[PDB]
Structure 1
């Protein structure tokens, strides 16, 4: 085994390997997609592998739904390494670790490079990861120039609807690191004040009154409230929003299962935000 450093922690893992089981870390699925890593175990979404991942799940068995690792299945696999998530309860990470060397992959989007390089070190694809990272940075440089100065001064928010409720995220979490950090838009105080994924009322949103709203809605994450979006859209308080009246609401401009803090999420969000904020596909 070889010493792998990841966010001031060291793990001994047999590398390079393909015996990788991914549970909870949708981030690592997105890194696997761009690195062309075909893991032994991957996350299922309502019992299937989404079309967007089918090119890297061809060799994989499901580890379970994102939040619900099947420890018996993961044991069955005897992976060289398990890519878990920092979003699991600690007790659940401990249980996962009974099936093998377990690395909790960070959901903090500012760690996107470290996450990619982790998977790259595990699979011998450092050169490929660095090229991907370099290409994002070049894309960011070019894209920033294509977005008008008024757009860059607007009040923009990313929300995700889960079980029919509205969630915001910290400045360095989800897509916010790209929207505020990379593109330079100003994070609303409610985002600055968020300590983690945080429920926001439609009432509070109406006071924030953003100019632009990116709404992410996965049917899979709203099985309890399937019409949540149409219901929202008919609400008088939602209808009072500046963004809603100006037709500046962008629903699923990136696939709603996208996690935000990955190369792939960032490049997709960079382009979507460019198009939507400038209201022109040329961006």
Structure 2
């Protein structure tokens, strides 16, 4: 018989505790697995390979495919007890994935970082480890707020992700923004308050926003269509006009560019990075 795992208003029947976990779409769950020492059966590949930072937990895994492109033939062959999917998949892709087994769309909304973590914990029987990781972050946070200067806290700060050579911004509770604005208390700017999903933003618009600090996240595996995007930007006269640029307050990949923002592991890293960068000295 199985157990009833409750996950964000929904309930799922899953035989737990299981090692037979297929992760597709949800890089969030990859990051949770990493801190929980969960070694899934299926894991997400990134350009066909498993990045160094995940190798400790991908040792018993085979690919479910690239992030946005689940391999149903592979996932069926695995016959998992649970498939951890993403809330970013179209519904028709979620229904198609669910032919291979019990499927839980894991939230990409960064304010659900605790629930996502506990879900994997509940599936794997590691609630103690998951509570300890969460508690530790909260202490890390309270301790880190004290180290961050007033000026920095009242500055205009942005997180951008460059994908296929375009600039994207995100809602207030998505990506790292829940840590930059929510946890550290910096004022989210209007364009971010207005964002309802991953939203394209022009350099032209950015130059009006004129942020004090810009965290730029850039992955080659997401920029194959234009690999010079970062260097071409830095040579654009509208980018060179930015306050953040001229004052040397642009931080490229302060956290690994495959980091998703809405996880314990993303939050702890961004919190330390933001702290180092905003206060201009290593903590």
Q: String of CA shifts for 1:83-120, please: whole Å, max 9, x gaps.
A: 00000011000000000000000000000000000000
Cα distance in 2 between the residues matched to 1:206 and 1:22:
39
The 3-state SS of whatever aligns with 1:214 is strand
- Per the TM alignment, residue 12 of structure 1 is displaced from its structure 2 partner at its CA by 0.4
Is 1:177 paired with 2:178?
yes
Q: String of CA shifts for 1:118-154, please: whole Å, max 9, x gaps.
A: 0000000000000000000000000000000000000
- Per the TM alignment, residue 186 of structure 1 is displaced from its structure 2 partner at its CA by 0.2
1:25 aligned residue: 26
Cα distance in 2 between the residues matched to 1:281 and 1:166:
28
Cα distance in 2 between the residues matched to 1:39 and 1:194:
34
The 3-state SS of whatever aligns with 2:77 is helix
Q: String of CA shifts for 1:221-269, please: whole Å, max 9, x gaps.
A: 0000000000000000000000000000000000000000000000000
Cα distance in 1 between the residues matched to 2:232 and 2:279:
28
Superposition pairs for residues 13-52 of structure 1, below 5 Å?
Answer: 13-52=14-53
Aligned-residue RMSD, C-alpha:
0.3
The 3-state SS of whatever aligns with 2:117 is helix
Q: String of CA shifts for 1:56-85, please: whole Å, max 9, x gaps.
A: 000000000000000000000000000000
The 3-state SS of whatever aligns with 2:259 is coil
Q: String of CA shifts for 1:13-71, please: whole Å, max 9, x gaps.
A: 00000000000000000000000000000000000000000000000000000000000
The 3-state SS of whatever aligns with 2:196 is coil
Aligned length: 282
Cα distance in 1 between the residues matched to 2:71 and 2:44:
10
Cα distance in 1 between the residues matched to 2:169 and 2:227:
20
The 3-state SS of whatever aligns with 2:98 is helix
TM-score, normalising length: structure 1? 0.99
1:248 aligned residue: 249
The 3-state SS of whatever aligns with 1:133 is helix
- Per the TM alignment, residue 10 of structure 1 is displaced from its structure 2 partner at its CA by 0.1
TM-score, normalising length: structure 2? 0.99
Cα distance in 1 between the residues matched to 2:126 and 2:163:
35
Cα distance in 2 between the residues matched to 1:124 and 1:242:
49
Cα distance in 2 between the residues matched to 1:138 and 1:281:
19
Gaps spanning 5+ residues in structure 1: where?
none
Report runs of 4+ in structure 1 exceeding 2 Å deviation.
Answer: none
Cα distance in 2 between the residues matched to 1:89 and 1:52:
28
Cα distance in 1 between the residues matched to 2:13 and 2:122:
12
The 3-state SS of whatever aligns with 1:238 is coil
Cα distance in 2 between the residues matched to 1:60 and 1:27:
17
The 3-state SS of whatever aligns with 2:187 is coil
- Per the TM alignment, residue 180 of structure 1 is displaced from its structure 2 partner at its CA by 0.1
2:64 aligned residue: 63
Cα distance in 2 between the residues matched to 1:7 and 1:253:
31
